[model samples]
Each structure stands twice: as C-alpha cells, then as structure tokens.
Target: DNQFYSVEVGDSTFTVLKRYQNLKPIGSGAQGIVCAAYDAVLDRNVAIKKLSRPFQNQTHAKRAYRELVLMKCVNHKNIISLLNVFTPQKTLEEFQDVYLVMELMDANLCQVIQMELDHERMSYLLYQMLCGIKHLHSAGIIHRDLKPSNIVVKSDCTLKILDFGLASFMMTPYVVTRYYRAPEVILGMGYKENVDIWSVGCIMGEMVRHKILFPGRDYIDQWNKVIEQLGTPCPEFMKKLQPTVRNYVENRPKYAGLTFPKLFPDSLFPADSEHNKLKASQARDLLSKMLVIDPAKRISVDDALQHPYINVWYDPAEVEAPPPQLDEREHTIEEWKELIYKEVMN
Candidate 1:
C-alpha cells in the first residue's frame, strides 16, 4: 500500500521507512533531506537520504541516476557507502520518491571546522580527502563540489566524502560553489579532474583559517577575490580565456600576491608536536601546489596523497584500490525509472 508517514526528529520532520526506527533529521540540502535512523534488521544506525523531486525533469532525472550509479560503483574507506536503496511506491508510475541508506557519520566538516585541530588531525583529514578524490579520479569521475559541508567525519576522525549528485565527467562553469570553484570553471574554460584539487586547496586553507578563503558575491567577484589574494593569473593562463574575458583580466590591476608564508602564517597553525610529522612549512607547500590559479599547474590527487605533509598517514592499499566498474550504456528516462525502481526494491 502506498502511504505517507511523518516522524519528528528534533526540530525537523522526516518522512521515512517503518523499518528505520528513531528517525532523526540530520541534514537537508538541494539534493535531498537526510535523517539518522536505527535499522532494526541490520541492528545498526544508518543515514537515509530522501532524494528531492528526482524525476521532475531531465536534469533532475540524470542527477539522480548518476548519484545512484556512482555510489553503488565506488568502494573506498573515505567515500560514503550506499547500504541500500528503496522507494515507498510499488509501481514506476507512482515512484516519485527515492531513499538511499548509508553509514551515519557523527558530524560533517562544517561542525568539525569550529573545533580547534592540531597539525596531526588536519593533515590526516586532508589525506583521507585526497585518497577519496583519487579513487573517484581513477574511475574517470569528478566530484565537482568539494566543500567542507559535503565531507563528513566519524568520532575517531575518520573522514568520508559524500553528496555525489553534482559529480560528473562533464565540466560546467556552474558546477562547483563560487567560493571553492576553480578559475577555469569561473572563466568558462574547459576543465578536467584537477578542478577537484582546487576545491581541496580552498578547503585546506579554510581548515587553517577557520573561515572561507574566498567569499565571492558573484562569478566576476569570485575571480576578483581569488586574484586579490592569490594574485592575477599569468599570460599563459590569460591567453586561454575568451577574448572579452582576456581583455577584462588584462585590464585588472596586477596583484603580486602573498607568499604561502604570508597567506598561512605560523600564528594561524597549531603549535608543532613531536608525535605528529606535519609541519607548517610542509602544509604550506602542499597548499601552494593545490591552489595554483592555473588548472594546468594544479597538483594531481596522486601527488597530493604523497605530499610530505600528508604521506606520513598514507597506506599503499588505500591509494591503489581498484576503480569501480562503471556502466557506460545510456538509458532513456523510462529505462532509468525502471532501473531505479529495481534498485530501490533490492
């Protein structure tokens, strides 16, 4: 029987499965609404995401399909696992809802960002992020959005990347959020996997400063904010821009930019310790490489994982994990609906 039911968790109300007890709303965004629930059959806590209007249009349908397929394919310690998928409706005609079950994390990086973290914790967290992104890149996938809120952590400091609804191989200027977006994306230039590295750099910088590194009011403002601090792009990068964009970029006052030492001073970092191998200098080096305005020069995930600042915590197996087998076959909207329905039923 098709039924609608609601459960109140804290201040938010969630519509969820009867099998998932003690449903409590944890997070909500444009992609979906998430709630923490106790799985009676599995005897464990799980996070359930109710995808928002998944079939509203072609765009929404494609996003839902990509997210489901990618989550099922990718397997990594630093990547969120899709435990189960289900829909409340019994038939495709009524299948307007999709629910995804996943591992329930203690808190997202947004919450963790408020806490004071030493070099050890920060480095380990960043290392995990790179490992996850490396896994995605190995599979020829790109996590277009890499903000802190999209990454979550366990109580023991284990971090995992989530929210793949916006991930894709296709590059679009509107893909990533303005603050973490790369210069190539802002300028509407062709982009590749390295775009994620730029976002990771922004995140790492934020972890150090306890604030957004670039808070842009708009796309043009985003470029201005980046150049204001990181300095203007070189002639080589400028030459790649469209004619009007190139002219505008050339006319802007040239900013010499702050060195890594000036951008991330020792005062902003936690005091060094003997137990941890991370140092202010090592971190600054990694940040400089990752935050390069030119995507051509940005550090790769493989290189980032091996950086001195983070490699101390590296395990070869984690970095060398096999890529997920992807299905390249295209499906019509109806076929997608059927596939998603079967996935939900299973």
Candidate 2:
C-alpha cells in the first residue's frame, strides 16, 4: 500500500512507522533522507524527508518549523508546497525525527535542460527563473541557493524554486554561491535579493554554455575563480569587508592576506576577442550587473524584469496556469494500480 497518509503532528505511532521506513532507506543525505511510505487514508504517492538527528536541537527544530511556515505562507504558482510538518515534540517526548511533506516533482532544471535538444531556450529559461525569483523577492524572501539543480521544471515546462533549507530572512545586502557567488559574498559584503540575481546570471551562463561559469574545486578556488572572473574589489568594495576581513588582512604574516590584484592575475576582461564574442559579451555584462562587486550597484528584481533579455524572450501573456488538483479519492498504491488496469484494459 502506497497511499499518501497524513501523519499528524502529534502521534507516537508515526514515530514507529518512521523508524521502519528509515531502516529500509530510500535516499539519504548529509542533512536528511527521503523515504517511500504507505498512507492508507490518502490515495496518492508521497515522499517524506526525515532530517538528521542533529536537527532535533531546539534551535534547529525551530528553524525547520520556521521553514515550514515560510513555505506555507508563500504559496506561489512556481514554488513548492509543504503538505505538512511532523515534529517529535508534538508527537512524543523522546522522538528525534522531524519530517516535512512536499510534492514530488519529476526532475530538476539541470536534468530537464540536459534533456533538451535546443539550447536557445536558455534565455527563456532564465526569464522563467527570474519570474520565480521575482515572486520570492516580492514576498521578501531570498533563495540563498539559486543553482540550476535546485530549480525544478515540471512536465509542462513550468519552473519552481525548490530546497528552502538555506533560505533565511533577507535583510543582508548580499549573498552569493561559492563559484557563481557574488563579489559581495566573496568579500563578505552584505547581501539581499541581489545575491540571488547574481546566481541566476551564473546559472543562465551555465545552461547556455553547458558548463559552470566559475567552476571552483574548493572555497579558496571558488574565491579565486570569482576574483579571476570579476576584477579585485576596489577600495570602496574593500571597505565593506573592513570590519570582518580587517583582522585577517592585518595578520598577513600568519594568514597571508590576499590583495585583489595579487590573488587574480588573469582577472581583467579583454577589450577585443572573436570567441563567441556577442554571446560572451551579453553574458558578461549581465553577470557583472547581477554579481556586482558592490551590493549597492547590483540590479533589483523589478529592474531586472525590465531587462531587454526578458522583454525579448519572456511573455507575461504566455505564462501557464498551475496544474489541476488531483481527485480526492484515497487508496493505496496497489489499489491505484488496480484502478488503472481496470480502467484501461478491462
């Protein structure tokens, strides 16, 4: 039986069921694992994410609850939905598992992109991505991680932002990915929504070129890669990280502080080049604006929505509606298979 059952927030029996599912192990991760289960009352398929035991700590548990609340509140057409939240404290005194129920989309953006034959849709994909990011930003949220793999494209070509594990209240001035990470993040520059814009730009480049824009082997390499792509932070930029990076810079003998120029030798952009010149120029310009070395100069979601790229490719009129709701009938997977076979073959 594989019916999607509703696990009440405060139920001790659910813990025993969760333990049984964990032992059979569908998929596990550093932070959590996804498992398959049967819910007799609800006739549908569902996946459960059981976070690591460390997440049982009060602070971490609260964060998980906070994420659930955020997901529930911001129900956009392009965002994933949190069906329910299961907490041990609510269910029993000694339970360590915290489970989140979410809709299981088929594939993420990277996989979908790889399956596509035409690469030109990248621009359109970027526009759709911006649409999703814009919606999140409008709601005053920043998806800290905006890489391709985190984006899910439904079978109908609709894009949704997934993985809110790194989501945080967006008051900072900047936030960036490790490689496609914005300069503000690299220099420890304050960040906000623009940080996501920067990652979007990098993702667009990767999707079009079929390669990572700033591939880094590690943190230092990621930092170096960013510096090499975008020139060293200027005096004003350096001042942003002065309070945090100052100690490191002053302790050069011990930490060997890096200067913008010294850390990146091939950092400057060439004035003239014939290699994918037009496309490269467009991508570089967009990325520079999105990943501005200065957070203050980075483009806003509203303004980015007006970019020529979006105007040229994305059509607000072309936007699709959300999928229809599934029938409320409840049955296990075996029953569902029987229904399908009877309806089609009988």
Candidate 3:
C-alpha cells in the first residue's frame, strides 16, 4: 500500500519541500529505506532516506550522526554529497524523525556491471572508485563498507561512493560487508585502509564475469569463498591481526582450493574467443594483485592510479558510450552556496 510521508526539517516550510512529486518506494535495506521523489521546483529527481522508525535505537542514532558528520566534512569528486537534512519536531502522535537527502543515483555499480559495458568504460568506472577510496584514505577515513552496491554510477559514467554509516576514523576496527569483507575481517585480523582494496577486487571480478565471485550463502561459506579465491593470508600477517579477527573463525585451515586459473579457466578467455584473450588476462592479473591476501602486498591506491588496466590518459576516443541523463539540472555553485547558507542559518 502507498502512504504519504514528508519530513519538515529545520526552519524551512514543510509544505514547500513537498512540492516534488511523491514517487513510489524503490528499495530498502538494513540501514534505512529509500523513496524516489520528483522535485517540481527543481524539475528533477532526488532520493530521500528516512531513519527506520522501528529500528531507531541508540546505535542507529550514533551511526546516523557519525555518517552525517563524516559526509559533511569530506568532499571528493567521486563521493556522494548530502543535499539536505530534515529533523522534525515531535508531532501529535509521533516522535521526531530524521531524514537525509542526497543526490539521486540512477543505479549502483552492481547494476551497471550487469549491462553490456565495454572494457574501457568499465576501467573508467573502476578508476573513479579507486580515486574515491584514495580520497577517503588521505583524509584519515576508512570506508569499511566498500562494495559494488555502495558505489553509484551516474549518467556521466562517473562513480560515487555512498553509505558511510559504517565508516570510521582510521585505526578503528569494524567488519565491513560479508561478501567483499577483507580477509583480515574474516580471519579475525584488525582492519586498515587496505580492506577497501580487497573489496574493489571482488567488485571488479563480479562486474567482468556478470556473476558473483564470492557469493557466500552464509557467514561460514563467505570465509571459505575468500580462501577459495585469494588463497590464505600469510602467517605473519595473521599474527598481526590475531587480536580482533580471532573470534570470527577457528582452526586456520590449510590453504586448499581451486587456483584462480583453474576455477575460471575461461575467465582468461571469456566465451573462448581468442581475440579477447589478452585483454581478459590483463584485467584478471590486475584484479588478482588487488585481492592479494597479504595486506602489505595488496596494490596501493596510488600505484593503482598508474596501472595500465585503468588508462590514466583521459582520451575522448575511449569514451565510446554515451552518458546517462538526469531529468534535473546539475547543482550549480550558486545553488550550493545558497543551500549551505540556508542550512547553516536555520
């Protein structure tokens, strides 16, 4: 059933905010639920995330606050921007609700990869993801949850990282997503910036193959999935991460499983087409290095910027595909200033 809901935020008039067409619901998840709305004033679309009423707890509040603070402070070319925020005062029969407004993304990386995207275009998107991760690391922030679903691809072929609710300041321990979770997280090892690299590798593999590389049905299966693909972590690195990751798994099983080449023998030559073999192999090698079990040995963001897999040279010819179109106009500098001023003044 469809119901009408709107959050009156700050000192701004609530009715004015509702000028946008209240579109139907789109998707929901552990963190919150998202609704699609068309803003008539801007003649565009936007996504509004409401803090789940039933799940509203101390932990959820803290996460919302933390992500808001982090997102507000950090700005990057490939990072999603918070457009507006709403905090309603208690009404007749309801508690105050918190809502965050962000730029509407057409579809995430997980969806884009399923499309028939060309290799060069895929590389372009991956490079943007790496750039966003680099930005986070430089700011002393670790986006623990770095997965395809968290990456949104706009119409311009550009990518942006979303949902920083699980992110934390550097040197903190937090388990990211299960499928793309770093080996250290699974092995009871402490997490660091490199965890993002492991996730990128997983996403890249899935995008290229159009199948989940590590679709662990359950927690135990998830761990086995990682080991099956990247092999086991080095004993020394394991010792370093022994403190936190210890409780997650036990009996550090022997490194036994299918090798990369054997598991997807044709991954080196998708469709057994000889013409695309070299291209496929190069991409596979790059992904292998990014997912290396040894955190120390994993490819660094800076080094990845220089990798041939991602053409560093911005060539117009390479962009063979057209960009995605959004019904709304791009947010301009003046609009940003006005919005920021309005937010601060209120």
User: Judged by lDDT, which candidate is best?
Assistant: 1
Candidate achieving higher lDDT, 1 or 3: 1
Q: Better model by lDDT, 1 or 2?
A: 1
lDDT of each: 0.80, 0.54, 0.64
Over 5-121, each residue of candidate 2 has an lDDT whose tens digit, in order, gives 334222222342332232223443334556555443354445566654433333344444445556656666667776656544432234355666665555667676455323245
For every model shown, what is its TM-score relative to the native structure? 0.89, 0.63, 0.75
RMSD for each model, in Å, please? 3.9, 12.1, 9.6
Angstrom error at residue 256, model 1:
1.0
Please give the distance, in angstroms, between residue 271's alpha carbon in candidate 2 and its true position after superposition: 22
Error of 1 at 205 (Å): 0.3
Report lDDT (Cα) of residue 207, candidate 3. Answer: 76
Model 1 residue 213 CA deviation (Å) reads 0.9
lDDT of 3 by residue, 235-312 (tens): 666667655464344355766656656654653344445545665666767787787877888887767766777755
- lDDT agreement of model 2 with the native: 0.54
RMSD of 2: 12.1
